[PDB]
Structure formats: C-alpha cells, structure tokens
C-alpha cells in the first residue's frame with residue numbers, strides 16, 4: 363500500500379566558521395540511510411539500502427549529493443553574509459524531499475524547506491517558490507536560484523524520475539523487512555491520578571497499526587486514552603492506553619489488543 | 634524555539650532481575666541542539682545509545698536514547714534533558730511503581 367520515502371536534511375549555522383549538515387532517509391517508518399556531517403559517503407542502514415541501482419548508478423547519485431552538500435553550505439553562508447543584520451545567527455535550515463508511492467505505478471513527489479523551524483520554500487513543477495507569508499527577503503534569492511537552470515533540471519529529474527524509480531527498487535529489495543510482522547507483548551500497571559490510572563502497555567509490534575481498548579466484558583470503555591506511537595530501538599513500536607478508574611471499580615476490567623501479527627488471536631489481559 | 638517533551642518506557646514487561654531496555658524518547662524540540670542523559674539513582678548512565686536525529690511532519694525534532702538495564706526493586710531511573718528553550722534541565726522519571 364501507501365509508502366512515503368523521505369530524505370531529511372538538517373543544517374545548522376552557528377556563525378561564519380561553524381556549520382554542520384546531517385541527513386537521514388526513511389522508507390515509511392524504517393530508516394534506510396544516514397549521512398553524517400563528518401562522513402564523506404552516505405551510509406546504508408539496511409542490507410537493501412542501495413535498492414536496485416547498480417554501483418555506478420549509486421556512485422553517480424552520491425557524487426551529486428556530495429557536490430550539493432558543499433554547494434548548499436557555501437550558498438547559505440553567502441546568503442547570510444548578504445543579509446546583515448536582517449536574520450543573523452544561529453540559523454537552522456531543514457529540507458524534506460521525496461515521493462509518496464500509491465497502489466499501481468503512481469506517485470507524487472515533494473521538496474519542502476523550512477527556515478528557523480518554519481516552512482518557507484517548496485520546489486513545485488519547474489521552479490523554487492516561496493510560500494505565502496514567507497519573509498519578503500527570500501524573494502530575490504529564490505529568483506536568483508530560479509535562474510540556475512542546471513539545478514532546476516536536476517531537481518526535476520530527481521523528483522519526477524529518480525525518486526519513484528529508486529523507491530520501486532527499495533520496495534522490491536526490502537520486501538522481507540517492509541512486510542515483517544512482529545508480535546506485541548502487553549502488560550498492565552498503574553500510575554498516579556480515590557482514582558487510579560490503569561495502564562495497558564503494548565510493545566514490540568510491527569507494523570504500526572494496532573487496536574488497544576479497555577473492556578468490561580464486551581463493552582468498550584470509552585474512557586480509554588491511547589497515547590502516541592513511541593519507537594523502540596529495534597524497529598518495533600510501543601503504545602500505551604490508559605483508563606482512569608474509581609477505587610474499587612477496577613475489578614472486571616480487561617485490556618484487549620488486536621494486531622495483524624496475531625492472526626485473529628487477540629491478547630486479553632485482566633486487571 | 635520549542636520545548637522538548639520526554640517519555641520514558643521499557644522495551645519489555647519489567648521483571649526484577651531480568652535484562653531489559655529503557656527508552657527515553659525526546660520530541661517536539663527546536664533548535665536541534667540538545668543534551669540527553671539517562672540516570673540511575675541520580676547518577677549519569679555511561680552506556681547510552683542514541684538514534685540519529687530526525688524530524689517530523691511539523692518540522693519539530695526527535696531522537697531516541699536507550700540503555701540496557703536490569704530492573705531491581707529499589708533502583709530508580711530517569712531521563713534528564715538540557716535545551717536552550719529551558720532555563721532549567723527537565724527530568725522525567727521512569728513510571729514503573731509510581
């Protein structure tokens with residue numbers, strides 16, 4: 363089904379002489395690449411991180427990114443130089459680029475840029491453009507950037523062609539990981555806030571979708587409060603669902619967990 | 634500038650005497666510069682693994698720290714974070730029997 367491929371670039375500029383750029387790459391919720399500032403080469407975080415690209419195809423792609431990383435750092439430091447004292451140090455820039463894959467052979471690509479934690483610029487169609495409400499000083503530099511037809515053509519190639527092409531290959535090569543099923547383990551505890559908060563912990567499941575509910579018999583307890591999905595370090599998930607209960611009303615309560623890995627055999631724990 | 638949120642949780646059901654992993658997940662912060670410590674009875678834990686820093690759809694950063702641990706009845710664990718958004722470090726204690 364739906365897979366989003368995200369290349370995430372994080373650049374920090376503290377002053378004229380200190381900057382660092384680190385990147386991570388995700389296919390859905392699995393990390394496929396890491397590119398540390400103090401590494402010349404992009405590192406694989408899966409056996410299949412090269413997808414179906416040949417070594418030569420990968421080397422070509424990497425060299426382009428290596429040139430880009432140095433170029434981006436110079437260009438920004440020069441943009442800041444010609445921007446004193448409009449918006450000075452420290453400066454944080456983030457870039458999020460990739461493509462969302464859909465059933466069939468369809469996809470949509472994106473390239474978004476944030477400045478000081480705020481979305482300011484996208485590449486759209488054939489050009490860089492500032493988003494409504496972005497700082498006005500960005501207008502001229504984006505027009506300058508748009509005059510670089512070489513960069514524009516390359517970005518168009520990367521979004522329109524290279525992204526979906528690479529991802530199709532990742533999806534084939536990474537099949538056993540992407541389609542892995544890991545079983546949740548659940549346990550019950552309580553924490554403060556007479557009322558107590560009952561906690562159903564669900565951990566070690568993959569993929570992400572999961573159903574967790576407090577129950578009294580067949581009755582779903584609508585007081586059930588599901589937290590956020592929290593990552594474990596072993597590419598599985600953690601979630602808890604809580605229920606605030608009056609003292610002496612705990613008896614008869616159960617936590618029921620449904621997950622794809624369990625094949626219809628729900629976990630049921632009784633308080 | 635955005636304040637980090639901190640969530641502390643074990644990988645497995647906590648059993649005293651049984652090896653486990655404690656997670657400290659730090660989210661929603663900006664700028665990306667941050668110091669994360671995991672603590673055992675108020676003392677810094679030396680061997681703490683950090684994930685690569687990443688960021689979410691809303692552009693806020695996140696990172697996972699984790700450490701191997703064997704729960705006992707009396708040991709208390711916490712995660713302490715220093716960040717420019719806060720004048721004081723923020724500490725969150727592991728919940729188990731709280």
Ligand SMILES: CCCCCCCC/C=C\CCCCCCCCCCCCCC(=O)N[C@@H](COP(=O)([O-])OCC[N+](C)(C)C)[C@H](O)/C=C/CCCCCCCCCCCCC
Nearest residue numbers: 369371385429430433434441459475477512513516520525
């Ligand atoms: C994208 C999916 C492709 C699939 C590949 C998957 C593998 C990924 C592994 C690691 C990826 C690492 C993450 C990188 C993020 C992707 C970035 C894509 C861009 C590539 C461009 C290449 C061309 C190039 O590098 N462009 C630069 C260098 O050009 P050049 O003239 O020196 O020559 C380059 C070669 N070329 C072929 C002739 C173009 C050019 O100078 C723009 C650089 C700046 C562009 C960013 C500007 C954004 C605006 C920010 C302003 C707002 C902030 C405020 C500032 C104060």
Ligand SMILES: *[C@@H]1O[C@H](CO)[C@@H](O[C@@H]2O[C@H](CO)[C@@H](O)[C@H](O)[C@H]2NC(C)=O)[C@H](O)[C@H]1NC(C)=O
Nearest residue numbers: 471486487488489514515517518519521522523
């Ligand atoms: C990449 O795809 C985009 C569409 O997503 C193409 O942009 C279109 O280009 C034509 C002429 O170049 C314009 O008339 C359209 O308005 C553009 N569409 C949008 C949505 O802006 C672009 O040409 C493609 N680039 C390459 C190299 O194939």
Ligand SMILES: *[C@@H]1O[C@H](CO)[C@@H](O)[C@H](O)[C@H]1NC(C)=O
Nearest residue numbers: 375376377378379380381451
């Ligand atoms: C620039 O910032 C870095 C990182 O904070 C710092 O270590 C360095 O001293 C700064 N350099 C100057 C010249 O101020």
Ligand SMILES: *[C@@H]1O[C@H](CO)[C@@H](O)[C@H](O)[C@H]1NC(C)=O
Nearest residue numbers: 379380381382383399400401
């Ligand atoms: C990041 O990498 C660049 C390019 O090699 C290097 O010059 C710079 O000193 C690095 N930044 C830090 C903070 O180490």
